[PDB]
């Protein structure tokens, strides 16, 4: 059906259809939520979550892929106490993809081992991963997820159940999925840079009952390039198609 | 290897 920019007389464009926003857990998106549990391994979640979410998006396949197969061995990351996102999926274009759910759980890392050439089934990736802040102005013009970074002012996990505005943490501490952007109202202006009703929905790896029931809305501009919290620094898009 | 006929469940 015919949804958006269509020349009808004389002028045209370049797939620049709205310059507006709607959220992408509602229009084909999102996978379930998960608890991190005396382990800080959020790289794992965001990273392997993007593989699984791009599955449910690109193909209507719906894989609820595991997290203790890059946190039982990614011998290029430094444990449940370390790991990056700069290269947290580049260890699944060499592993065959990570082994999956309903035949393997996450188990909190009481000092443990790998079980990787044990399974008959695997689901992995083909393409690479890097979203520039020059693709986070249209952020989800892919119709699919992103793996940006968030710093926490520790006035973050404060179960605001809502929105947070402010100058965030100090270093890109935690890893956060991008479940989309929302657009509530547009600027209600002040002397300079007035009230932001516009919002940014982002999933998290902390818990399932936290804020917007596992998610956190924050405060973007018309575009997405004038926030704080340093989001747009480490964005990556793991694809298989 | 263990591919179709070998695996248990």
């Amino acid at each position: 059906q015919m949804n958006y920019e269509e020349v009808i007389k004389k002028y045209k464009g370049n797939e620049n259809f709205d310059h507006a926003a709607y959220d992408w857990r509602l229009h084909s998106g999102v996978t379930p939520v998960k608890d991190q549990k005396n382990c800080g391994s959020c790289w794992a979640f965001s990273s392997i979550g993007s593989v699984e979410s791009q599955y449910a998006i690109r193909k209507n396949k719906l894989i609820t892929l595991s997290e203790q197969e890059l946190v039982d061995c990614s011998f290029k990351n430094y444990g449940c106490n370390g790991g990056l996102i700069n290269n947290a999926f580049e260890d699944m274009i060499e592993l065959g993809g990570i082994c999956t759910d309903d035949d393997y759980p996450y188990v909190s890392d009481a000092p443990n081992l790998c079980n990787i050439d044990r399974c008959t089934e695997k689901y992995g990736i083909k393409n690479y991963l890097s979203v520039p802040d020059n693709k986070l102005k249209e952020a989800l013009r892919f119709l699919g997820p992103i793996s940006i970074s968030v710093a926490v002012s520790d006035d973050f996990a404060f179960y605001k159940e809502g929105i947070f505005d402010g100058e965030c943490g100090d270093q890109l501490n935690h890893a956060v999925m991008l479940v989309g952007f929302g657009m509530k109202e547009i600027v209600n202006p002040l002397t300079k840079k007035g009230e932001k009703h516009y919002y940014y929905i982002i999933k998290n790896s902390w818990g399932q009952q936290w804020g917007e029931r596992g998610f956190i809305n924050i405060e973007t501009d018309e575009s997405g390039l004038m926030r704080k919290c340093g989001l747009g620094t480490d964005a990556f898009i793991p694809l298989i198609e | 290897k263990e591919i179709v006929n070998p695996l248990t469940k």
Binding site: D35, Q36, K37, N38, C39, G40, S41, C42, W43, S46, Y78, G79, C80, N81, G82, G83, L84, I85, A88, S149, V152, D154, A157, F158, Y159, Q171, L172, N173, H174, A175, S205, W206, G207, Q209, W210 | -
Partner: protein, 98 residues
């Protein structure tokens, strides 16, 4: 800094010292050291489902000590309990993991 990790150590302010006293209740029913109260002068903090503190406390003849706890997430009272025991480990183990 590291997603899931941290950066260097920060100057010991009294709030990690209150986390200290909660750790010491836990520490004495299964530690040979019939324990008590200590003195905290180093730490590091992490981004977990919680805040995964480490407490450098001084003890013993001339060795020093180290521990782990987490200010839980603001579910209910943040009622921190353990997640690590490495007793009388020196001030020079680079703030360890237990």
């Amino acid at each position: 800094m590291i997603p899931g990790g941290l950066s260097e150590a920060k100057p010991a302010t009294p709030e990690i010292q209150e986390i200290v006293d909660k750790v010491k209740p836990q520490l004495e029913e299964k530690t040979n050291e019939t324990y008590g109260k200590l003195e905290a002068v180093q730490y590091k903090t992490q981004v977990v489902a919680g805040t995964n503190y480490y407490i450098k406390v001084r003890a013993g003849d001339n060795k020093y000590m180290h521990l782990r706890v987490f200010k839980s997430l603001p579910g209910q009272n943040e009622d921190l309990v353990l997640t690590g025991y490495q007793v009388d480990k020196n001030k020079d183990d680079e703030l360890t993991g237990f």
